[PDB]
Design a protein around this ligand. Structure first.
Ligand SMILES: Cc1cc2nc3c(=O)[nH]c(=O)nc-3n(C[C@H](O)[C@H](O)[C@H](O)COP(=O)(O)OP(=O)(O)OC[C@H]3O[C@@H](n4cnc5c(N)ncnc54)[C@H](O)[C@@H]3O)c2cc1C
Ligand SMILES: Cc1cc2nc3c(=O)[nH]c(=O)nc-3n(C[C@H](O)[C@H](O)[C@H](O)COP(=O)(O)OP(=O)(O)OC[C@H]3O[C@@H](n4cnc5c(N)ncnc54)[C@H](O)[C@@H]3O)c2cc1C
Ligand SMILES: [Mg+2]
Ligand SMILES: [Mg+2]
Lengths: 294, 294
């Protein structure tokens, strides 16, 4: 039957949304495909109360708690289509199954598209990362590499000295100007301009000139993709730039489409678990308020 | 010696800030007086992973985790004065002890000023609350009261029907207009206009006419106070309205004063633990970035 809210995506953001709506006893459906952005990492860091915990265990415990609310409904599955408008949205699940709802919350996360460097992808989440707060500390102030992939490369490079002795591999992507050259030096960054052939060993960068640089870990900047083809038909504006796509939201997490809210990495290009949880909580309350004061 | 950052307040917001800065290995001092806004409640609700946990236990566990970072420093104490400007702030603790820092994070929370109704204060956090998401569910759809204290009274009243059978006590504070009268009725709110004499029993409202209304719990809207006298000397703009004070911040949690960030209920008038944690995480990263790119 017609749900009050369908939440598309059931990880940190979508669960945090569900929790608020279940405590308000609203009739909601969480639909989740179970492929979370941090599945590649062994331990989560930086989220208060859970620093060090396995990312899947944080989820498992959140779920045990959220399942105690009988108005929260759950389907494991993937939304293959969604359409309609305020008060009458229609969602298709696994190309079969169809459900309807008066409001939608989009909490799908993003997928990371990485530079095309042999060896890099296999190492994602174990020796190659994107977020220094997330995974820099445990490199124990060893040698750290930063691979340019994006316009922002130099900014990311200037951050990593606070975590170890940093080498910035421009990889033909970026050529710093005199002021950038001067700043990289003062901040103690080694700038390596030789192209990268592959990542080998734990996090050894093999350069095109034959040299190999042994590092404790590597960071680069992924391009973020939203992996559904139906956002346009719902009518939400999406911000599209060199580092990927983000659903536009206001400070209350409403998208440009009435009745549709978004939260988590799908709506924040530099997200974290702490922020997904915060933004999901806001999105659940805002959707509730849209039902109370329509 | 001179800290990179002093964080004033060490509960959810300030700890979440500290966690990010400790993982960046910045030299910071947390100063905390240990009197948290939710100390009056037995269990916390609505924060992913911790739904149901005692509020003090969430803190205790966060602290065990955050104490493993050797660059995070801790003093138990109250900041009695703070002054200075970017790169040279001076903090006085317990009117003695003086510490200096290049940046400040304000994470002091707020104090709740309640209506002057006999019996109400003694019941705060046990049978009288402010936040329906926080404490409505466990009233188990019993009878619920909402006491007008503020301009927003009618909005708060219109929310509570989703939690139980609601009586709105206008208490001489507010007189709804025809449209409000009509909405309260359609939403199933009982409007009680008789003045309140006292709160008795668990949550029995004794009215001025001699009637007593037995309720499972009560909600009202507290006026929020910031209980330091030195914000003005630091130079931060503060928003002052009928429901209290909030430090002004931008979306990166910087106050109008360079080098000073704010997070948690001190910078959000409708806060929660989830939002304090999110906003603290942002504030810690932003302060770090202000040290990296000054
Ligand atoms: C390698 C790595 C390590 C990280 N480590 C940390 C860390 O230590 N600490 C930290 O704070 N942050 C870390 N992050 C970031 C963290 O992963 C994200 O901030 C967080 O996962 C975002 O939560 P989310 O709910 O928005 O998205 P996700 O966790 O990514 O969840 C999205 C969910 O929605 C589902 N979904 C997507 N589309 C559909 C659909 N069409 N229908 C149904 N379901 C769908 C997915 O299957 C998934 O289960 C890390 C990121 C990476 C890549
Ligand atoms: C009764 C009640 C129940 C609540 N229940 C929930 C709930 O279930 N779930 C939920 O999400 N939210 C709940 N809330 C809200 C929750 O309490 C706040 O959102 C949260 O505490 C805010 O965190 P904070 O860090 O900003 O402030 P606080 O937790 O209030 O912490 C402020 C800290 O700073 C310290 N401090 C202040 N001034 C100074 C100073 N000058 N020098 C040094 N230290 C100082 C204080 O002593 C304190 O330790 C509830 C609120 C109330 C009143
Ligand atoms: Mg990462
Ligand atoms: Mg409360």
């Amino acid at each position: 039957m017609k749900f009050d809210v369908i939440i598309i995506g059931g990880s940190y953001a979508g669960l945090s949304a569900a929790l608020q709506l279940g405590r308000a006893r609203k009739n909601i459906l969480l639909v989740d495909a179970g492929e979370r952005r941090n599945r590649f990492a062994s331990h989560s860091h930086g989220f208060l109360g859970q620093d060090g915990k396995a990312p899947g265990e944080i989820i498992a415990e959140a779920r045990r708690q959220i399942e105690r609310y009988p108005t929260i409904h759950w389907v494991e599955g993937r939304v293959t289509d969604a359409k309609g408008s305020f008060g009458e949205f229609i969602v298709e699940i696994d190309g079969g199954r169809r459900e309807t709802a008066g409001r939608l919350i989009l909490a799908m996360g993003v997928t990371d598209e990485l530079p095309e460097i042999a060896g890099l992808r296999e190492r994602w989440g174990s020796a190659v990362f994107h977020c220094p707060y997330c995974h820099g500390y445990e490199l124990d102030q060893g040698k750290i590499g930063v691979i340019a992939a994006s316009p922002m490369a130099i900014h990311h490079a200037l951050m990593l000295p606070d975590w170890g002795e940093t080498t910035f591999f421009t990889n033909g992507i970026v050529e710093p100007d005199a002021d950038q050259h001067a700043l990289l030096a003062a901040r103690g960054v080694r700038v390596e301009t030789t192209r990268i052939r592959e990542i080998a060993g734990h996090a050894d960068v093999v350069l095109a000139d034959g040299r190999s640089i042994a590092l404790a870990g590597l960071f680069t900047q992924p391009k973020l993709r939203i992996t559904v083809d139906w956002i346009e038909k719902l009518g939400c504006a999406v911000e599209e730039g060199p580092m990927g796509s983000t659903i536009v939201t206001d400070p209350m997490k409403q998208t440009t489409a009435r009745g549709i809210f978004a939260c988590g990495d799908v709506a924040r290009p530099a997200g974290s678990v702490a922020l997904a949880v915060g933004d999901g909580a806001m999105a659940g309350a805002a959707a509730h308020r849209s039902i109370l004061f329509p």
